[PDB]
Amino acid sequence: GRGRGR
Amino acid sequence: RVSSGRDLNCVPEIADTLGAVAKQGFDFLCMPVFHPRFKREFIQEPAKNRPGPQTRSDLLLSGRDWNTLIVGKLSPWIRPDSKVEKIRRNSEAAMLQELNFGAYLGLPAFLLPLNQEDNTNLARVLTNHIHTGHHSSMFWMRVPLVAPEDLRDDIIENAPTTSGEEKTWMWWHNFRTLCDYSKRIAVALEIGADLPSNHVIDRWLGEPIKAAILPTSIFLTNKKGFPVLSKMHQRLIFRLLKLEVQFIITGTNHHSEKEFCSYLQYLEYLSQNRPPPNAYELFAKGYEDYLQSPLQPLMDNLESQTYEVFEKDPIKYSQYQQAIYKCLLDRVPEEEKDTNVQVLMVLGAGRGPLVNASLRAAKQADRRIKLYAVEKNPNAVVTLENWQFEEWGSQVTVVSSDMREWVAPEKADIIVSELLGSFADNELSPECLDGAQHFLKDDGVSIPGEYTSFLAPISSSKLYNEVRACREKDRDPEAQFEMPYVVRLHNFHQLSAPQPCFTFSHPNRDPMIDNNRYCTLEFPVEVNTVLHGFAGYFETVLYQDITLSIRPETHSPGMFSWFPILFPIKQPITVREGQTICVRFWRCSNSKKVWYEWAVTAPVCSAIHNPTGRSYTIGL
Ligand SMILES: Nc1ncnc2c1ncn2[C@@H]1O[C@H](C[C@@H](N)CC[C@H](N)C(=O)O)[C@@H](O)[C@H]1O
């Protein structure tokens, strides 16, 4: 999960 | 490439009309399924016995054309909320018939008008239709920006003209509420001859707008006779193009000396001359309003393909290198450069990016350093071992342990560690750093030196619908509202500017350390709007003037590592202009887990969300 999430 | 369609009321033959519309360059055609003037009866005896086909057969087009090119429009003569019993009954029957036929065709979207103060019975019929059968058509509620009664000319002697600027939105909201925020009801914003205040447009852009209807009468005439939008309609069209709404050009050709395609062409021009996306936006494409659960490295190990995305950001590590450079310059004077060896401890070295940054900073600063890279995820420890054996060599010592359970051989002159999330302490950075302090030199420093988290109310029916769609079985049905989600807010409206809460500083050497926090925030409100949750950002000071931030007004250029966080609330909170939203946040811990509780109090007291971490906790 790109960004800061799954 | 902007996707736009055509709206028509006269369709003598479907095939020819579709051919001509496609030739002009449109993508889809909004037409009436039944002839608009063909009134039908269902109760009266002599009339209801009408022989012959009601509407043109569905065999006229292929099964694919209906699903991609046609948008059904409700007949104008239907008025469910009429005040005459017979008219209302006939309207209900006809609307149900038309919706059923549209579903039978397979129409991607169906247009329904909202041009009245009351739409309760229409909402009831629509809700009945949505919950019956296995159809999937979307419904677009054509609602104007300015009510018809307000934009009419002042040419009546018996009735001169003139919160009144927002009444149209109130029509939508109520209707939405009657349908219970159904995922299948969108808005077809019908632009007007003149725009309202900026606040009205801002509130509207937070709604689930799927299409925007442009009358041909809006366009002005340029010097060569071609249609052109006004200077403010231009900005509004740009703002809509930030979203992915579809443009429906309606009306007739008010510029007879030019081909109708011009109306489309100009739109395309605005699409092609739109300001280019920046690096951050290009990075974020594909995850707008895509709810994701936060990462909890302290308990769950990451995978290599997450460190990969973590490494793509060049801003974060450049800032860290600058901070290390400045700190090393400050601590070591020039005369002691030869022999003063500073000890740096990276906590959570990952796959070695921060180790490389630290080594580069020391190299450019001309100061010698010893390096200890701590890491718990054994998979990352394998990569760190390979890095150390091949290239770093003796200068770097890799340790496979938790910094809270590690016994360092010597105290650290500098500590470097990034353990922040969307919310600054979302990732339990304070808990790990406070434990790590026990091997930090008395005059040593820690990077980041400080971080604060800011909170701001937001309004987004889209995000509320996603949160509701996160309904998973085998758990409390309300649990989806009691946990935060990391997501890129795109289709949302900000009610007020963010305010700080839960500041943290390192190293914290007060007599007794406590990481539990409680904050009360008061946000002024300027427009009648519905609060759906609170968005959280974070800012941080690494060393002196070196900083990172994702707060909207001080976002670091191009730093796309972190997305905002979203704390939802179970029930939307309606707020009026001049009121104050009073939210309260608690950061609680019990030496085994950590959680966040939040409650709204001023507008209308809401329940305390996520009590005792029953719905969301971070392992400690
Ligand atoms: N309490 C802890 N003890 C040891 N390692 C930890 C602890 N909490 C988090 N970590 C590690 O810290 C690391 C976080 C970083 N790798 C994240 C990206 C960072 N830019 C890097 O590439 O190093 C992960 O490997 C976690 O396993």
Q: Identify which of B345, B354, B356, B375 to mutate to test ligand 1's pocket (most ligand atoms within 8 A of the CB).
A: B375
Taking the C-alpha atoms of residue B271 and residue B609, their distance in angstroms, rounded to an integer, is: 43
Token reading at B380: 């990352």
Element of type H or E holding B310: helix B304-312
Taking the C-alpha atoms of residue B320 and residue B317, their distance in angstroms, rounded to an integer, is: 5
Residues 1-6 of A with CB under 8 A from B: 1-6
Which residue of B284, B292, B421 is in closest CB contact with A1? B292
Using the mean position of ligand 1's atoms as its centre, give its distance from the Cα of residue B498 in Å.
29
* Beta pairing class for B499-505 and B485-486: unpaired
Token reading at B491: 């289709």
Q: Does B485 touch chain A (CB under 8 A)?
A: yes
Amino acid at B136: S
Are the C-beta atoms of residues B220 and B228 closer than 8 Å to each other? yes
CA distances from B215 to B30, B229, B254 (A): 14, 11, 10
Are the C-beta atoms of residues B146 and B168 closer than 8 Å to each other? yes
Q: What are residue B361's phi and psi, to 5 degrees?
A: -60, -45
Task: Find where tokens 């086909």 sit.
Answer: B53
Token reading at B306: 């997450």
Closest CA to B242 of B194, B274, B195: B274
Nearest CA residue ID for atom 11, ligand 1 = B348
Are the C-beta atoms of residues B248 and B4 closer than 8 Å to each other? yes
The SS3 assignment for B186 reads: strand
* Pocket lined around ligand 1, Cβ cut-off 6 Å: B 297-298, 302, 307, 310, 348-351, 353-354, 375-377, 380, 402-404, 418-419, 432
In B121-259, DSSP assigns E strands to 138-144, 185-190, 209-215, 220-221, 227-228, 246-250
List of residues 6+ apart from B212 with CB closer than 8 A: B188, B189, B190, B191, B240, B245, B246, B247, B248
Do A4 and B295 lie within an 8 Å CB cutoff? yes
Q: Does B562 touch chain A (CB under 8 A)?
A: yes
List of residues 6+ apart from B253 with CB closer than 8 A: B216, B260, B263
Taking the C-alpha atoms of residue B293 and residue A5, their distance in angstroms, rounded to an integer, is: 5
Q: Does B488 touch chain A (CB under 8 A)?
A: yes
CA distances from B339 to B332, B334, B367, B369 (A): 10, 10, 9, 10
Are the C-beta atoms of residues B489 and B464 closer than 8 Å to each other? no
Token reading at B402: 């938790």
Taking the C-alpha atoms of residue B524 and residue B527, their distance in angstroms, rounded to an integer, is: 10
In B393-494, DSSP assigns E strands to 396-400, 412-416, 440-447, 450-459, 485-486, 493-494
Nearest CA residue ID for atom 7, ligand 1 = B298
Angle between helices B198-205 and B231-242 (to 10 degrees): 20
The SS3 assignment for B248 reads: strand
Catalytic residues of B: 418, 427
Taking the C-alpha atoms of residue B180 and residue B130, their distance in angstroms, rounded to an integer, is: 12
Rounded to a whole number, what is the distance in Å from the CA of B412 to chain A's nearest CA? 29
Are the C-beta atoms of residues B50 and B40 closer than 8 Å to each other? yes
Q: Identify which of B302, B346, B371, B548 to mutate to test ligand 1's pocket (most ligand atoms within 8 A of the CB).
A: B302
Cα B82 from chain centre: 38
**Radius of gyration for chain B, computed over Cα atoms and rounded to the nearest angstrom:** 30
Q: What is the resolution of this structure in A?
A: 3.2
| 8-state DSSP, B287 | -
Nearest CA residue ID for atom 13, ligand 1 = B348
The SS3 assignment for B399 reads: strand
Nearest CA residue ID for atom 3, ligand 1 = B402
Task: Find where tokens 């609680």 sit.
Answer: B588
Query: Would you say how long chain B is, in residues?
Result: 620
B348: left (phi over 0), alpha (psi -120 to 50) or beta: left
Taking the C-alpha atoms of residue B467 and residue B498, their distance in angstroms, rounded to an integer, is: 22
Token reading at B87: 């008219």
Taking the C-alpha atoms of residue B135 and residue B28, their distance in angstroms, rounded to an integer, is: 20
List of residues 6+ apart from B569 with CB closer than 8 A: B481, B531, B532, B533, B534, B598, B600, B606, B609
Taking the C-alpha atoms of residue B146 and residue B287, their distance in angstroms, rounded to an integer, is: 33
Start-to-end Cα distance in chain B: 48
Using the mean position of ligand 1's atoms as its centre, give its distance from the Cα of residue B403 in Å.
10
Using the mean position of ligand 1's atoms as its centre, give its distance from the Cα of residue B351 in Å.
9
Closest CA to B207 of B502, B530, B500: B530
Are the C-beta atoms of residues B189 and B246 closer than 8 Å to each other? no
Which residues of B carry a binding-site annotation for a protein?
A: 310, 418, 427
CA distances from B491 to B105, B287, B334, B449 (A): 31, 11, 53, 34
Rounded to a whole number, what is the distance in Å from the CA of B354 to chain A's nearest CA? 18
Element of type H or E holding B363: helix B353-365
Using the mean position of ligand 1's atoms as its centre, give its distance from the Cα of residue B454 in Å.
24
Taking the C-alpha atoms of residue B358 and residue A4, their distance in angstroms, rounded to an integer, is: 23
Are the C-beta atoms of residues B257 and B224 closer than 8 Å to each other? no
CA distances from B113 to B117, B163, B293 (A): 12, 22, 38
Token reading at B573: 């909170």
Amino acid at B77: W
Amino acid at B179: C
Token reading at B385: 């071992």
Taking the C-alpha atoms of residue B217 and residue B374, their distance in angstroms, rounded to an integer, is: 67
Query: Would you say how long chain A is, in residues?
Result: 6
Do B294 and A4 lie within an 8 Å CB cutoff? yes
Q: What are residue B19's phi and psi, to 5 degrees?
A: -60, -50
Task: Find where tokens 């019975």 sit.
Answer: B121
Are the C-beta atoms of residues B485 and B615 closer than 8 Å to each other? no
Rounded to a whole number, what is the distance in Å from the CA of B609 to chain A's nearest CA? 21
Domains of chain B: 4-292 (3.20.20.150), 304-447 (3.40.50.150), 450-619 (2.70.160.11)
Which residue of A1, A4, A6 is in closest CB contact with B562? A4
Rounded to a whole number, what is the distance in Å from the CA of A5 to chain B's nearest CA? 5
Element of type H or E holding B24: helix B14-24
Residues 81-140 of B with CB under 8 A from A: none
| Chain gaps in chain B, named by the residue before each (C–N > 2.5 Å) | 162
Start-to-end Cα distance in chain A: 4
Are the C-beta atoms of residues B371 and B361 closer than 8 Å to each other? no
CB contacts < 8 A (A, B): 36
Nearest CA residue ID for atom 16, ligand 1 = B350
Using the mean position of ligand 1's atoms as its centre, give its distance from the Cα of residue B375 in Å.
6
Q: Identify which of B299, B324, B347 to mutate to test ligand 1's pocket (most ligand atoms within 8 A of the CB).
A: B347
Do A3 and B485 lie within an 8 Å CB cutoff? no
Are the C-beta atoms of residues B16 and B29 closer than 8 Å to each other? no
Handedness of CA B104, B110, B113, B117 (dihedral sign): positive
If you write DSSP's letter for every residue of B525-591 in order, what string do you get?
Answer: --S-EEEEEEEEEEEEEEETTEEEE--GGG--TT--S---EEEEEEEEEEE-TT-EEEEEEEEEE-S
Closest CA to B54 of B93, B83, B88, B2: B93
Return the exposure string of B362-389: e unless at least 16 CB atoms fall within 10 Å of the residue's CB, then b.
Answer: beebebebbbbbbbbbeebbebbeebbe
Are the C-beta atoms of residues B536 and B395 closer than 8 Å to each other? no
| CB count in 10 Å sphere of residue B336 | 11
